[PDB]
Design an enzyme around this catalytic site. Structure first.
Site, PDB file in Angstrom:
ATOM      1  N   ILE A 143      -8.203  -0.064   9.783  1.00  0.00           N
ATOM      2  CA  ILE A 143      -8.874   0.814  10.176  1.00  0.00           C
ATOM      3  C   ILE A 143     -10.439   0.249   9.529  1.00  0.00           C
ATOM      4  O   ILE A 143      -9.810  -1.212   8.878  1.00  0.00           O
ATOM      5  CB  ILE A 143      -8.682   1.710   9.800  1.00  0.00           C
ATOM      6  N   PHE A 155      -5.807   5.931  -0.072  1.00  0.00           N
ATOM      7  CA  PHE A 155      -4.766   5.004   0.130  1.00  0.00           C
ATOM      8  C   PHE A 155      -4.817   4.777  -1.604  1.00  0.00           C
ATOM      9  O   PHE A 155      -5.975   4.470  -2.184  1.00  0.00           O
ATOM     10  CB  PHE A 155      -5.248   3.685   0.987  1.00  0.00           C
ATOM     11  N   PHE A 195       3.585   9.906   1.607  1.00  0.00           N
ATOM     12  CA  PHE A 195       3.068   8.574   2.231  1.00  0.00           C
ATOM     13  C   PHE A 195       3.807   7.670   3.202  1.00  0.00           C
ATOM     14  O   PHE A 195       4.959   8.135   3.451  1.00  0.00           O
ATOM     15  CB  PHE A 195       3.122   7.632   0.805  1.00  0.00           C
ATOM     16  N   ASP A 196       2.841   7.274   3.969  1.00  0.00           N
ATOM     17  CA  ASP A 196       3.078   5.773   4.632  1.00  0.00           C
ATOM     18  C   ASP A 196       3.063   5.134   3.496  1.00  0.00           C
ATOM     19  O   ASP A 196       2.267   4.351   2.940  1.00  0.00           O
ATOM     20  CB  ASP A 196       2.418   5.512   5.573  1.00  0.00           C
ATOM     21  N   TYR A 242       0.864  -0.961  -0.265  1.00  0.00           N
ATOM     22  CA  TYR A 242       0.218   0.225  -0.014  1.00  0.00           C
ATOM     23  C   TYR A 242       0.890   1.020   0.089  1.00  0.00           C
ATOM     24  O   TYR A 242       2.225   1.450   0.872  1.00  0.00           O
ATOM     25  CB  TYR A 242      -0.691   0.153   0.976  1.00  0.00           C
ATOM     26  N   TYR A 288     -10.067   7.472  11.742  1.00  0.00           N
ATOM     27  CA  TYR A 288      -9.604   7.815  13.186  1.00  0.00           C
ATOM     28  C   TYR A 288      -9.937   8.743  13.919  1.00  0.00           C
ATOM     29  O   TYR A 288      -9.722   8.546  15.180  1.00  0.00           O
ATOM     30  CB  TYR A 288      -7.944   7.862  13.172  1.00  0.00           C
TER      31      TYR A 288
HETATM   32  C1  LIG Z   1      -1.776   5.161  13.565  1.00  0.00           C
HETATM   33  O1  LIG Z   1      -0.794   4.334  13.079  1.00  0.00           O
HETATM   34  C2  LIG Z   1      -0.572   3.812  11.915  1.00  0.00           C
HETATM   35  C3  LIG Z   1      -1.226   4.382  10.969  1.00  0.00           C
HETATM   36  C4  LIG Z   1      -0.210   3.752   9.576  1.00  0.00           C
HETATM   37  C5  LIG Z   1       0.767   3.279  10.193  1.00  0.00           C
HETATM   38  C6  LIG Z   1       0.867   2.908  10.970  1.00  0.00           C
HETATM   39  C7  LIG Z   1       0.747   3.547  12.106  1.00  0.00           C
HETATM   40  O2  LIG Z   1       1.534   3.366  13.057  1.00  0.00           O
HETATM   41  C8  LIG Z   1       1.329   1.646  14.258  1.00  0.00           C
HETATM   42  O3  LIG Z   1       2.715   1.703  11.335  1.00  0.00           O
HETATM   43  C9  LIG Z   1       3.065   2.289   9.783  1.00  0.00           C
HETATM   44  C10 LIG Z   1       4.271   0.872   9.646  1.00  0.00           C
HETATM   45  C11 LIG Z   1       3.767  -0.579   9.609  1.00  0.00           C
HETATM   46  C12 LIG Z   1       4.427  -1.368   9.242  1.00  0.00           C
HETATM   47  N1  LIG Z   1       2.490  -0.621  10.269  1.00  0.00           N
HETATM   48  C13 LIG Z   1       1.193  -0.364  10.243  1.00  0.00           C
HETATM   49  C14 LIG Z   1      -0.220  -1.017  10.996  1.00  0.00           C
HETATM   50  N2  LIG Z   1       0.731  -1.483  11.877  1.00  0.00           N
HETATM   51  N3  LIG Z   1       2.227  -1.200  11.283  1.00  0.00           N
HETATM   52  C15 LIG Z   1      -1.442  -1.000  11.524  1.00  0.00           C
HETATM   53  C16 LIG Z   1      -1.704   0.382  11.663  1.00  0.00           C
HETATM   54  C17 LIG Z   1      -1.538  -0.215  13.740  1.00  0.00           C
HETATM   55  C18 LIG Z   1      -3.074   0.342  11.668  1.00  0.00           C
HETATM   56  O4  LIG Z   1      -2.963   1.498  10.311  1.00  0.00           O
HETATM   57  C19 LIG Z   1      -4.691   0.932   9.284  1.00  0.00           C
HETATM   58  O5  LIG Z   1      -5.317   0.508   9.969  1.00  0.00           O
HETATM   59  C20 LIG Z   1      -4.496   1.461   7.883  1.00  0.00           C
HETATM   60  C21 LIG Z   1      -4.492   0.342   7.286  1.00  0.00           C
HETATM   61  C22 LIG Z   1      -3.427   0.000   6.678  1.00  0.00           C
HETATM   62  C23 LIG Z   1      -1.674   0.441   6.533  1.00  0.00           C
HETATM   63  C24 LIG Z   1      -1.982   1.362   8.108  1.00  0.00           C
HETATM   64  N4  LIG Z   1      -2.650   2.395   8.194  1.00  0.00           N
HETATM   65  C25 LIG Z   1      -2.660   3.655   8.392  1.00  0.00           C
HETATM   66  O6  LIG Z   1      -4.070   4.480   8.643  1.00  0.00           O
HETATM   67  C26 LIG Z   1      -1.399   4.457   8.185  1.00  0.00           C
HETATM   68  C27 LIG Z   1      -1.535   6.025   8.402  1.00  0.00           C
HETATM   69  C28 LIG Z   1      -1.616   5.876   6.987  1.00  0.00           C
HETATM   70  C29 LIG Z   1      -2.090   7.678   6.222  1.00  0.00           C
HETATM   71  C30 LIG Z   1      -0.378   8.317   6.117  1.00  0.00           C
HETATM   72  C31 LIG Z   1       0.152   7.677   8.001  1.00  0.00           C
HETATM   73  C32 LIG Z   1      -0.248   6.276   8.015  1.00  0.00           C
END
Ligand SMILES: COc1cc2cc(c1OC)OCC[C@@H](C)n1cc(nn1)C[C@H](C)COC(=O)[C@@H]1CCCCN1C(=O)[C@H]2C1CCCCC1
Length: 128
Positions: A75, A118, A55-56, A45, A101
């Site tokens: 999410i 995304f 991006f992340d 992603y 969130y």
């Molecule tokens: C709010 O915290 C974060 C949000 C998001 C990424 C985060 C994060 O810190 C935990 O770390 C990125 C590191 C990777 C390996 N990761 C993803 C997750 N666990 N580890 C899953 C996350 C615990 C939850 O993430 C999500 O539910 C979504 C969908 C899956 C991919 C990550 N997601 C995010 O919301 C990212 C954010 C996306 C928009 C830009 C900022 C990061």
């Protein structure tokens, strides 16, 4: 750019039809199975605040992002959106804060009331 395109043309895949999760298929997948709840899912992603620039991305860590569908490890919008995807599919999602969130946010990465964008590539999924 891509977020605006999703606002303009994406399908609403919410049950409530509140436009909380908007989807465009960018590259069609193979199969006829979508994943179901409980499945282990593998993706790449790129995600970002919709009004943001950086991006992340999973690629930046050079490894796929793995999770179990519908188990609330991600999410609500991913649980909903990835459940619609075929293997090999690339989709764009645009997500209102209620399916991400919320008004609480998730600082430092996500502010209050953030809309998120995304691109998701579905690599694989296996059943519990
Ligand atoms: C709010 O915290 C974060 C949000 C998001 C990424 C985060 C994060 O810190 C935990 O770390 C990125 C590191 C990777 C390996 N990761 C993803 C997750 N666990 N580890 C899953 C996350 C615990 C939850 O993430 C999500 O539910 C979504 C969908 C899956 C991919 C990550 N997601 C995010 O919301 C990212 C954010 C996306 C928009 C830009 C900022 C990061």
């Amino acid at each position: 750019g891509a977020p605006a395109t999703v606002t303009e043309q994406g399908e609403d895949i919410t049950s409530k039809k509140d436009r909380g999760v908007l989807k465009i298929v960018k590259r069609v997948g193979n199969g006829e199975e979508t994943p179901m709840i409980g499945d282990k899912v593998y993706v790449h992603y790129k995600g970002k605040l919709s009004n943001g620039k950086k991006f992340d991305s999973s690629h930046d860590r050079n490894e796929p992002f793995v999770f179990s569908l519908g188990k609330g490890q991600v999410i609500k919008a991913w649980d909903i959106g990835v459940a619609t995807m075929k293997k090999g599919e690339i989709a764009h999602l645009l997500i209102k804060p209620e399916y991400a969130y919320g008004s609480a946010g998730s600082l430092p990465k996500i502010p209050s009331n953030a809309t998120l964008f995304f691109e998701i590539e579905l690599l694989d999924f296996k059943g519990e």
